[PDB]
Amino acid sequence: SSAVQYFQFYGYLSQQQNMMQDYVRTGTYQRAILQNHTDFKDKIVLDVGCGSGILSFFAAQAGARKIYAVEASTMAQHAEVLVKSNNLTDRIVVIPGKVEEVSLPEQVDIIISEPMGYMLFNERMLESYLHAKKYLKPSGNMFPTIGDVHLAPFTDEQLYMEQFTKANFWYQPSFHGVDLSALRGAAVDEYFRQPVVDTFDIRILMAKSVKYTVNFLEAKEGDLHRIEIPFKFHMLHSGLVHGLAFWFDVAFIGSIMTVWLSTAPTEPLTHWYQVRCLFQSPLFAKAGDTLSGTCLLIANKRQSYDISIVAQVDQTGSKSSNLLDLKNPFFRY
Ligand SMILES: CNCCNCc1cccc(-c2nc(Nc3ccccc3)c(C)c(-c3c(C)noc3C)n2)c1
């Protein structure tokens, strides 16, 4: 139902084009595959959620002997057209359906995919990627191999105030004669439930990031149903902490070289941008204080996660929580 919409979203060539036009994304995948040609020459490769098939062609440019491209949306029909018109019907085989349901005729030497949603984990496609390892030969590789999530406290008073400014629409005792003000708190709540997807100046960050690593070769599908990310930040600056910023890097660890794709705010912008989660109430922290807590991600049935963030300044005991709905963010860009 929710999944109906998820796969229809990816049936649009315009959504494929948005990702293809991300040059950092598309070019880094090309370079990771090509410059690791020994991982692909004459190999059998599985492309999980191939969309238009761009990754499958990159594996063919690298010399792969057979490429199974699995795609569940109507986009599979468009990739088929592309395979024929590029004369690769020998080397690339499009398989319509979910990776969890299709039948592959052999095991593969390497799995390739672009399974990262914003904040990495949205869409829960990492689980389909991990599930595909049931087709991975022993000692096969995964491209990408590693994913690092980073989180860091930020201060951004204008972003925080923007929330009450939008919800104060409801604080009118006479909107065309109607008292709206009893909904103001519900409206505040609704805005704070949304992660804020856009980029930002790195001068809002107040501590070195915490890194949480998922190893795609080692992880199991079940390991992503619940992601506990403890953190303890040593605050490099004093200020009001308004929430946590998130970005992610992935690594393609090939035989020839390791290529990184970063969505860090210190790196060229990508179509993933970065993600920020506001706290209920900001926390005052001195430089030298430690800010500790947990960011808990609980998979849900809308192909996404409920996000629970609890934090406290250890030196004073002031704490804040928040609960966010990652499926429904504010695309502030
Ligand atoms: C698996 N590799 C995906 C790589 N791209 C990740 C990515 C990066 C940046 C943004 C989105 C994004 N944009 C959406 N609309 C939209 C955003 C801005 C302007 C106009 C429309 C939606 C609806 C979703 C989405 C999906 C899918 N499922 O739930 C949700 C929510 N995601 C996705």
Side-chain angles (χ1 to χ4, degrees):
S1 152
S2 188
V4 161
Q5 311 293 104
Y6 176 83
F7 284 118
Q8 289 188 337
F9 181 81
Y10 278 110
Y12 286 88
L13 294 165
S14 61
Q15 169 57 217
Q16 295 294 318
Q17 172 183 343
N18 183 242
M19 303 188 299
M20 284 178 239
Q21 290 174 154
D22 187 341
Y23 182 86
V24 179
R25 177 195 100 125
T26 308
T28 300
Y29 267 88
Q30 195 179 30
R31 298 210 300 88
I33 295 166
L34 285 189
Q35 315 256 12
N36 274 294
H37 43 84
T38 50
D39 282 79
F40 293 90
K41 187 53 183 199
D42 304 313
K43 314 275 188 187
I44 318 292
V45 47
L46 169 60
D47 187 355
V48 175
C50 71
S52 64
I54 184 67
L55 282 195
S56 282
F57 295 106
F58 289 168
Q61 300 176 358
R65 148 190 148 101
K66 192 63 98 60
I67 310 173
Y68 300 110
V70 181
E71 175 51 53
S73 76
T74 62
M75 191 56 54
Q77 78 197 327
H78 293 320
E80 192 47 53
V81 162
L82 280 197
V83 163
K84 294 172 188 291
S85 74
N86 287 260
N87 304 310
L88 285 170
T89 70
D90 44 309
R91 296 170 79 209
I92 302 172
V93 171
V94 177
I95 302 202
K98 307 206 228 292
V99 75
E100 301 80 2
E101 289 160 358
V102 297
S103 267
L104 250 64
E106 60 178 298
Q107 305 298 90
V108 308
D109 300 293
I110 179 162
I111 311 190
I112 67 177
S113 187
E114 191 276 274
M116 302 90 67
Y118 56 80
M119 226 187 65
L120 176 53
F121 295 111
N122 191 58
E123 301 184 44
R124 291 178 66 185
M125 196 182 161
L126 287 176
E127 282 157 65
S128 301
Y129 185 46
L130 290 186
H131 178 95
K133 280 195 304 195
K134 77 179 192 201
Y135 296 114
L136 188 58
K137 279 167 160 162
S139 147
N141 208 348
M142 316 265 291
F143 259 24
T145 313
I146 284 321
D148 302 335
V149 163
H150 293 263
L151 52 143
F154 68 88
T155 186
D156 194 337
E157 182 70 34
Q158 300 179 286
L159 173 63
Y160 181 90
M161 285 186 321
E162 165 170 338
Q163 305 317 312
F164 290 88
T165 297
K166 291 194 289 207
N168 278 346
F169 167 79
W170 297 92
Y171 208 57
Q172 301 183 53
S174 171
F175 177 84
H176 304 255
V178 179
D179 188 347
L180 306 179
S181 60
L183 290 185
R184 195 266 194 163
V188 167
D189 263 299
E190 170 175 313
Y191 289 124
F192 275 88
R193 275 192 81 76
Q194 301 172 35
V196 181
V197 184
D198 76 349
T199 186
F200 52 78
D201 195 313
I202 69 171
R203 286 137 89 211
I204 69 168
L205 304 174
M206 300 168 79
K208 283 184 50 86
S209 75
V210 157
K211 195 184 72 175
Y212 184 93
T213 293
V214 181
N215 187 316
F216 299 128
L217 290 168
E218 310 246 350
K220 294 151 304 299
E221 210 188 315
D223 296 329
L224 302 187
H225 297 155
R226 169 191 180 275
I227 305 157
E228 184 175 8
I229 310 186
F231 55 83
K232 179 145 48 182
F233 294 107
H234 183 269
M235 303 297 289
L236 303 190
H237 306 258
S238 307
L240 311 201
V241 185
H242 296 111
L244 304 179
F246 300 74
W247 62 94
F248 67 87
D249 313 318
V250 300
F252 311 80
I253 307 167
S255 304
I256 292 167
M257 71 180 315
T258 289
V259 168
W260 288 88
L261 165 48
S262 184
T263 65
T266 65
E267 291 302 320
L269 191 56
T270 77
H271 80 287
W272 284 279
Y273 291 88
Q274 288 96 33
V275 181
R276 284 181 281 170
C277 295
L278 298 164
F279 289 151
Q280 310 275 327
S281 352
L283 298 170
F284 313 79
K286 306 332 114 178
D289 282 349
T290 64
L291 170 87
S292 52
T294 289
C295 166
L296 191 54
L297 308 183
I298 307 175
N300 64 39
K301 280 154 210 91
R302 282 125 48 220
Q303 305 78 231
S304 192
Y305 288 82
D306 311 317
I307 304 172
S308 179
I309 292 159
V310 190
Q312 63 171 30
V313 183
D314 294 331
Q315 282 71 4
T316 81
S318 48
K319 36 210 291 193
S320 175
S321 34
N322 201 10
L323 198 298
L324 298 95
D325 186 29
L326 180 62
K327 178 62 155 178
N328 297 297
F330 174 37
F331 290 109
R332 186 168 195 231
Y333 71 89

